[PDB]
Amino acid sequence: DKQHFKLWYFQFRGRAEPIRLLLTCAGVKFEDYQFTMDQWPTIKPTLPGGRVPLLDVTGPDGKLRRYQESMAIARLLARQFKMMGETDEEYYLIERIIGECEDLYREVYTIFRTPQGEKEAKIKEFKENNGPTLLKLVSESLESSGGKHVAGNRITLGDLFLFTTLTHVMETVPGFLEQKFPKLHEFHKSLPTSCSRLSEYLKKRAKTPF
Numbered sequence: 001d002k003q004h005f006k007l008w009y010f011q012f013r014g015r016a017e018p019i020r021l022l023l024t025c026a027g028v029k030f031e032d033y034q035f036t037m038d039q040w041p042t043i044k045p046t047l048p049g050g051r052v053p054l055l056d057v058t059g060p061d062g063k064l065r066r067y068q069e070s071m072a073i074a075r076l077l078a079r080q081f082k083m084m085g086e087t088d089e090e091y092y093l094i095e096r097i098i099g100e101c102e103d104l105y106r107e108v109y110t111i112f113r114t115p116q117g118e119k120e121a122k123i124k125e126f127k128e129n130n131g132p133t134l135l136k137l138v139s140e141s142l143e144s145s146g147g148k149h150v151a152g153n154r155i156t157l158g159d160l161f162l163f164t165t166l167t168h169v170m171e172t173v174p175g176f177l178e179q180k181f182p183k184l185h186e187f188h189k190s191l192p193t194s195c196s197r198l199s200e201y202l203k204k205r206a207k208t209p210f
């Protein structure tokens with residue numbers, strides 16, 4: 001007779017992962033429902049908008065509210081968990097990194113979705129053009145705030161979304177972050193020292209292609 005969180009998604013990190021990391025770092029238990037591709041066609045017609053992620057929150061009042069749009073869900077939760085910045089400047093810094101990372105996310109997702117044949121050319125394009133432009137911005141943004149956290153001295157949704165996005169860069173363009181953007185690589189290495197609940201979750205997490 002209390003609260004409950006149920007997250008709906010595919011068996012992927014993709015758009016769901018920032019929400020899972022947020023709930024994990026906030027110390028909030030939740031039902032992480034990850035369904036198969038085969039199960040989806042019969043789940044789809046039952047969900048609002050026919051897309052995932054969806055977060056079902058059963059309130060203190062026992063009532064159900066179903067939330068759509070991954071980073072809308074994430075920002076609402078982050079506000080509730082005091083992980084969306086404590087000043088307007090911190091809020092700005094968080095929004096700055098998220099905007100930059102949304103661009104990076106799209107670049108790398110496009111690569112993931114490219115067939116094996118045409119992938120390498122999209123990768124070379126990324127490494128020479130939009131990749132360093134975006135990654136420079138992200139590096140400069142993180143450097144401005146001290147290199148360890150996007151905003152304040154504690155974990156925020158900005159840190160977590162930066163982390164998930166860098167994971168995608170590291171997997172999609174192997175070695176690149178490590179050679180060209182070592183401070184971002186270091187952020188990715190060190191962030192779980194600032195959320196050990198994260199460290200545990202990451203180690204036990206199922207492996208997924210994206």
Ligand SMILES: N[C@@H](CCC(=O)N[C@@H](CSSC[C@H](NC(=O)CC[C@H](N)C(=O)O)C(=O)NCC(=O)O)C(=O)NCC(=O)O)C(=O)O
Binds near residue numbers: 051069070071
């Ligand atoms: N911005 C929303 C995106 C949510 C989203 O795209 N969900 C996808 C999974 S991530 S995957 C990203 C998504 N692509 C797709 O869903 C692939 C196309 C589909 N499977 C098909 O058959 O055509 C996409 O492009 N999104 C942004 C856009 O539309 O411009 C989904 O539920 N797909 C099941 C379905 O539609 O049946 C969020 O972050 O929550």
Ligand SMILES: [Br-]
Binds near residue numbers: 013167
């Ligand atoms: Br990720």
Ligand SMILES: [Br-]
Binds near residue numbers: 013017163164167
């Ligand atoms: Br991740």
Ligand SMILES: [Br-]
Binds near residue numbers: 175176179180
């Ligand atoms: Br390289």
Ligand SMILES: [Br-]
Binds near residue numbers: 139180181182183184
């Ligand atoms: Br760097």
